[PDB]
Design a protein around this nucleic acid. Structure first.
Ligand SMILES: [Ca+2]
Ligand SMILES: [Ca+2]
Ligand SMILES: [Ca+2]
Ligand SMILES: [Ca+2]
Ligand SMILES: [Ca+2]
Ligand SMILES: [Ca+2]
Ligand SMILES: [Ca+2]
Ligand SMILES: [Ca+2]
Ligand SMILES: [Ca+2]
Ligand SMILES: [Ca+2]
Ligand SMILES: [Ca+2]
Ligand SMILES: [Ca+2]
Ligand SMILES: [Ca+2]
Ligand SMILES: [Ca+2]
Length: 92
RNA sequence: UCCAGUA
RNA sequence: GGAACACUAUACUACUGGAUAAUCAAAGACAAAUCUGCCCGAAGGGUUUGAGAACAUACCCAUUGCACUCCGGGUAUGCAGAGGUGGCAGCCUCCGGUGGGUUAAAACCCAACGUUCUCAACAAUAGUGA
C-alpha cells in the first residue's frame, strides 16, 4: 500500500554512493518534491536505495511510471516502503 | 658506491 | 628538506640527472600573513620513520538485500597537501590537479575538492644567535 518512500533495488552495485545519489534524484525529480534519499553500500543495504517524496501521489506516480527503468544497465525494481521513514514519522 | 643541482 | 626556538655546516632522506673530469638541463609547495568564535590543558609550535586500525580507489569472491547508528571477505594501491602555537567550526592565503567564466590564445577570476586516528620509535652532532 502507497507510502511517501519507495524502495528501489536491483541497482548496479559498482556505482559510487555520490554518483548514484545525484542520478537517482535526477530521474525522480519530475515526479515531485524529494525530501531525502537514503543510500548505503553495506552488505545488507547495497544495490538498493530509499527515495522519499513529500506527497504520496508523487511516490505512487513515480513507482508506476519508472518500474523496470534501465538504471545503469540494470532494470530498476521499485516497490513501496514496507515501513515509514524516520524523516516522516517524526513530523506527522 | 661515488658527483652536481634542488627540496 | 634536515625532524622539540631560529639559522648554517655535516651525516643523512627524497626528487632529477650524471661516472671521478662526474657536464648542460630538468626537478622545486612552509611565500605572505599570523584572523573569528567556542572549547579542553600543568605546558599548545614534529616538512622523521614504523606498526595497527579506519577510510578511499581498482579488480576478485560472496550478497536481490526494508534501511533510516558507521561497519562482508580478499589482493593491490595511498608515501601532497601546506601555513595561520591544542581541538571543533568558519574564514584568509598557498601548492596541486579537475570543472566552469573570460580571451584570438594566454594570463585573471569563480567554485568544489585533496588521507585521518591510535600506539611505538626517533627528534643526532658541530657551530652560531636571545
Ligand atoms: Ca620548500
Ligand atoms: Ca639548507
Ligand atoms: Ca632538531
Ligand atoms: Ca626557508
Ligand atoms: Ca614565512
Ligand atoms: Ca593556566
Ligand atoms: Ca607544522
Ligand atoms: Ca573493501
Ligand atoms: Ca590495505
Ligand atoms: Ca594523496
Ligand atoms: Ca587555483
Ligand atoms: Ca590565466
Ligand atoms: Ca565549503
Ligand atoms: Ca599521543
Amino acid at each position: 500500500r502507497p507510502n511517501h518512500t519507495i524502495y528501489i533495488n536491483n541497482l548496479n552495485e559498482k556505482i559510487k554512493k555520490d554518483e548514484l545519489k545525484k542520478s537517482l534524484h535526477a530521474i525522480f525529480s519530475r515526479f515531485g518534491q524529494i525530501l531525502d534519499i537514503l543510500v548505503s553500500r553495506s552488505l545488507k543495504m547495497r544495490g538498493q536505495a530509499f527515495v522519499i517524496f513529500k506527497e504520496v501521489s508523487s511516490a505512487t506516480n513515480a513507482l508506476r511510471s519508472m518500474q523496470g527503468f534501465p538504471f545503469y544497465d540494470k532494470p530498476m525494481r521499485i516497490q513501496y516502503a514496507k515501513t515509514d521513514s524516520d524523516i516522516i514519522a517524526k513530523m506527522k
